[PDB]
């Protein structure tokens, strides 16, 4: 069983981070070194496992989550991070075992004048739990007055557009992100059996 990573990394569309996509993959074999050694990735960070030991992980399922964020937010896709992305859009668990892979996607996801397609959540009444998703669009009450469905002072639409422009600096350009999380019997995967 070869892991179907072609569908993940080379998907025809990528989700907004607030509506991040999850593909659930059963136990499978993959050549992780062709991924980890690829110059096409600007980030390849692993947690609870080293990239050279991915082939030896024992797991039941791997979740492949994917989305678009801007470059200076890739650092937030890690356990224990804070910020608008980690707190209100996509949150990893403390015992995350797997890797975070990103690459610059300016050539595909920017548009002259702005891209209105990719969004992120700006405000929330509480932080997301790990792997929670929130696609609601209720007006966010930042002040002392109920918004009651009207936008204005201290009453904000909760999503913001990235407006990815081709001439943005690299920290404001779009990056596609794939998060692989490995689970063994609903616990984190480990390198099991004879060492």
């Amino acid at each position, epitope marked *: 069983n070869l892991c179907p990573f072609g569908e993940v990394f080379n998907a025809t569309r990528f989700a907004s981070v607030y509506a991040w996509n999850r593909k659930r993959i059963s136990n499978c074999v993959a050549d992780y070194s062709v991924l980890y050694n690829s110059a096409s990735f600007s980030t390849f960070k692993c947690y609870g496992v080293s990239p050279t030991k991915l082939n030896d992980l024992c797991f039941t399922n791997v979740y492949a989550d994917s989305f678009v964020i801007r470059g200076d937010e890739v650092r937030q896709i890690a356990p224990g991070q804070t910020g608008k992305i980690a707190d209100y859009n996509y949150k990893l668990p403390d015992d995350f075992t797997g890797c975070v892979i990103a690459w610059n996607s300016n050539n595909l996801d920017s548009k002259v004048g702005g891209n209105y397609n990719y969004l992120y959540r700006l405000f929330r009444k509480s932080n997301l739990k790990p792997f929670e998703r929130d696609i609601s669009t209720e007006i966010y009450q*930042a*002040g*002392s*007055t*109920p*918004c*009651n469905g*009207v*936008e*204005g*002072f*201290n*009453c*904000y639409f909760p999503l913001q557009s990235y407006g990815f422009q081709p001439t943005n600096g690299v920290g404001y350009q779009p990056y596609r992100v794939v998060v692989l999380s490995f689970e063994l019997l609903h616990a984190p995967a480990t390198v099991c059996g004879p060492k």
Partner: antibody
Amino acid sequence: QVQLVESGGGVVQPGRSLRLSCAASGFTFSSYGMHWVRQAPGKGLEWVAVIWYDGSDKYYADSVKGRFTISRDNSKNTLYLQINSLRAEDTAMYYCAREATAGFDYWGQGNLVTVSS
Amino acid sequence: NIQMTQSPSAMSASVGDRVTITCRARQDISSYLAWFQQKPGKVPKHLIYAASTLLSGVPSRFSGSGSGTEFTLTISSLQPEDFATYYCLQHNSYPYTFGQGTKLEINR
């Protein structure tokens, strides 16, 4: 026509107490949070306090917390600011303001508090 | 509290001129900065919120910008009614806090 009418100011002796009132008319009072702002003679604006539309959350400027209490009686459509142990730093024109989605869109006329012997 | 500092404290200009007023927050306040106008002895008037959104009815010659800690109010083509004191106010976290004000006076 939204109206906010303040009362309760005047000359008051140091160490005493007072309550300013801000009587609301022409709108659903209980749908709006309310703020107090002040301006000492010849000085700039100072934010004083805010109370939630439903009277729950209340917040205060660092310099007034503990001695000032903001409150509201929605059954009487009235906002209040109560000051204990008055001192010279409290002398100021006090304004109430409505917080709406439109902004701070309506204000009281102001009431002058003069702390003096 | 978050300290707000305006600059200059006073400036002079003439009808038809463009003027720029600066407001700096000692801590990051994102884009949640308001601007007010006050004439002597009169009630303040709320002009701008969230750094750049005009209240309804406010002339677009008033233009707010900035984010984080540095913010500006730019008044293009001054009209006689514009000479007045202008105050910023951060509305990002409690307690809300005003800058000390900038007085816009008539040059001669």
